[PDB]
């Protein structure tokens, strides 16, 4: 036929053009994300220097510093994006999360999870897995408020597991976690992006070898640590978004590249079909003519 071929040709051509256009959208947003990501370095450097200086001359004792003597459970948080067409980004996130769950299953601990993003939320909704709380609608553009509230929630959840012996919640009154994990993606290069999963719930101290405090040193210490946790959490988000966009661009590029060949092949087929119809009609009209 002819109408189907013309429709498919026009369809595929416009698909190719607008795949290139959306690739340009991704390329344009890459610059803005890259410019925005590197603006929080001085604050983190100053806060880390402050914590080093304070912990140098302070006592080393805190619930977030001390470890639970028993392996009850371990929490985890999974991040994702808020739009599709990202390629295997979400697949990579799911594989890393599943492999971390497999590694943790060796100890038999029943873990708990938190999610950010609609895609991972839906995927875990389809599967038989419990969810505590979900956050969505700011992966495109985050702020400090969401990171602060997430850090507050995680800190309170960790603190609520002081005396959870067996199934008893103890004086806490609610079952509390004993370990936390974070899974995200890192921007190694314009083409190098891999998932990184790390553990940062209990602090650890390493002595590398070799001021005055107006308020209480412990007061400064335990006021300080939550700020450091919040800064780490906030720093993760922009990195995740930048890696998401970087992986997003290549999908549209390859889509255009693959879309060209369908146009080529269908044009060839239409040419052959029209040539055949013309030759057969001329043959039949001549055959009708000469026989009489």
């Amino acid at each position: 036929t002819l109408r189907e071929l013309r429709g498919r040709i026009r369809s595929a051509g416009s698909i190719k053009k607008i795949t290139k256009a959306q690739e340009l959208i991704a390329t344009s947003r890459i610059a803005k994300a890259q410019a925005r990501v590197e603006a929080a370095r001085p604050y983190a450097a100053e806060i880390t220097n402050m914590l080093t200086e304070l912990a140098g001359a302070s006592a080393l004792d805190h619930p977030l510093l001390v470890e639970r003597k028993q392996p009850k459970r371990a929490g985890v948080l999974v991040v994702s994006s808020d739009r599709g067409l990202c390629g295997a980004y979400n697949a990579n996130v799911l594989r890393r999360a599943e492999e971390l769950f497999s590694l943790l299953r060796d100890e038999g601990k029943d873990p708990v999870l938190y999610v950010v993003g609609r895609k991972a939320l839906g995927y875990f909704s389809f599967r038989q897995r419990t969810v505590v709380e979900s956050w969505t609608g700011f992966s495109e553009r985050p702020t400090y408020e969401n990171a602060r509230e997430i850090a507050d929630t995680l800190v309170n959840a960790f603190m609520a597991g002081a005396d959870d012996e067996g199934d008893d919640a103890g004086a806490d009154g609610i079952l509390g976690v004993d370990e936390l994990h974070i899974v995200f993606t890192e921007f190694r290069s314009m083409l190098s992006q891999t998932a990184v999963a790390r553990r940062a719930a209990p602090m650890e101290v390493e002595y590398v070898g070799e001021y005055s405090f107006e308020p209480d040193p412990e007061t400064l210490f335990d006021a300080l640590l939550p700020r450091y946790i919040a800064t780490r959490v906030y720093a993760a988000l922009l990195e995740a978004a930048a890696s998401e966009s970087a992986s997003r661009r290549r999908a549209m590029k390859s889509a255009t590249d693959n879309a060209d060949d369908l146009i080529k092949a269908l044009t060839l087929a239409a040419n052959r079909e029209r040539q055949a119809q013309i030759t057969q009609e001329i043959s039949e009209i001549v055959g009708g003519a000469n026989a009489l």
Partner: protein
């Protein structure tokens, strides 16, 4: 083929198999260019099921004795329908694909799958 002459289970299984194959054929156009990344899991499951079943339709008849040098096999219809119902249920999805090439029955299916 009609339910008045054939058992209801046969009719239902045949209709479901046809529907699955038709759906895969319909999505074959879109999957040809993009692939599986954009496609949702709700269709990835049926894609995997369709691939497994269409690979399971292969068989090794005796007629190839002079080409591949392997004896053929025969299967009663009850075993065929029960095996196809099991496969449509999705119990076998964890098994690898290349285990379904040129196999006679479900017992040989399991033996080949466990052999790899």
């Amino acid at each position: 083929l009609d339910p008045a002459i054939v058992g209801d289970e046969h009719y239902r299984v045949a209709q479901e198999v046809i529907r699955i194959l038709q759906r895969y054929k319909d999505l074959q156009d879109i999957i040809a260019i993009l692939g599986i990344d954009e496609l949702s899991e709700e269709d990835k499951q049926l894609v995997n099921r369709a691939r497994r079943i269409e690979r399971f339709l292969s068989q090794n008849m005796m007629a190839a004795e002079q080409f591949t040098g392997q004896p053929g096999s025969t299967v009663p219809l009850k075993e065929t329908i029960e095996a196809f119902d099991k496969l449509t249920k999705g119990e076998f999805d964890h098994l690898p694909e290349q285990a379904f090439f040129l196999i006679g029955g479900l017992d040989d299916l399991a033996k080949k799958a466990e052999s790899l």
